[PDB]
Design a protein around this nucleic acid. Sequence first.
DNA 1: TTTTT
Length: 436
Amino acid sequence: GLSSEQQRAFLAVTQTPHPAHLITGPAGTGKTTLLYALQEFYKGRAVTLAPTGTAALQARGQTVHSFFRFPARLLRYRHPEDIRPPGPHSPLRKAIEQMEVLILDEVGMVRVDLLEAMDWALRKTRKRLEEPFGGVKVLLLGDTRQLEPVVPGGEEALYIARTWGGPFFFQAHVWEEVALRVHRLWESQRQREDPLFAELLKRLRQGDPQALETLNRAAVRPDGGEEPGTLILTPRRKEADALNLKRLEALPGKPLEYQAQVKGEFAETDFPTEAALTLKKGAQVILLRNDPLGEYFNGDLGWVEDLEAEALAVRLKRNGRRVVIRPFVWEKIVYTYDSEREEIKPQVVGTFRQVPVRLAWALTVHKAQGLTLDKVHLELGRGLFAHGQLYVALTRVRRLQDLSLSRPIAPTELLWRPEVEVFETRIQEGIWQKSH
DNA sequence: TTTTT
Ligand SMILES: Nc1ncnc2c1ncn2[C@@H]1O[C@H](COP(=O)(O)OP(=O)(O)O)[C@@H](O)[C@H]1O
Ligand code: VO4
Ligand SMILES: [Mg+2]
């Protein structure tokens, strides 16, 4: 059963014809758990999406990209080359046409161009350009104090700035057409049996510098990452590799190497996994691509069972089922700027073919947002770089005894986005309306 | 530098 404030948000969302709602609150307040109640109330009529694979599985839906078949690149505003409606007799078109409610968890990580593309895709497929999201009622859930959207730094960043003025979902132009009603949750549920830890996280969210000093004294334990049953989180992918390789070549099985084929321009900075990736039987892994046959998805955690030339078997954590993994192809897209028409054109400059698997004793903080973890050791590596990164790493566990840091954290390490301050200030009035 | 395919 839901809590009291969860039930108020349940009724305030399902008892009103209003088409746009946001349920927001600190990490672990029960937003995705109330999302489960919304899925039972709506079940056939609702589609549930999340921006990342891990969040999508945590919300028991799929990624936004996978549902609308969006390409994994910048979705220019209302651009036909990027937002293509489904076929005349496709299962997607009937899904979009029959759909009545769109639930979107972890909306804080949804970049503005992704949200505007959903708006346009729903309008175009339902043949209602007049109405935002094509008449679909959208239920948004997330926290803007958690991880900001991912914005690579090419002309992709300049376009987003020019078109919307920022990468956040609340900067979409559709909010000039609808008022977003805001429901707020406050009471901790993940940390409900450790109120002092919950109070600490509340103060850390407010930016308290003395809260950070109390955390540095209580939680800095360098060897925390070697205690059993501990998931390690890091800011960067390659820092996770160095940590996973330590636990990997400590396993008894025979190692097998999967060598990627790189074509054209594809820097190893952009590799989703290592070009020389070594696995062992029993290694803990996370899957990086969706199965066309639907047996596994991006974000699936599991353990290697068999290793052969270009095919490995993985036992999944999600359902205890055994799936077979084969190499996928990744495209590397860059954006060039025409001076004459003054437009950006995407272009493929390289490919990367490899088994879609990473070792998963250590993960990036981005792959952890939304998870409730039993034990977390945060390895800071070469520092934090994303707004909301530290706060997400700290709030995955239930009790402070389940958390440890590799080194103390300085106040000057902390990132604050001014657009998030402006947003979270106006939302306490209960409404978000983008003017002009 | 993190994500999506
Ligand atoms: N009303 C509730 N009663 C008991 N446990 C709850 C309740 N709401 C949430 N939880 C638990 O708290 C943990 C984190 O909650 P979650 O739904 O992930 O919150 P959020 O989405 O805000 O992070 C989950 O493991 C869930 O089981
Ligand atoms: O509010 V969270 O589902 O990122 O813990
Ligand atoms: Mg959640």
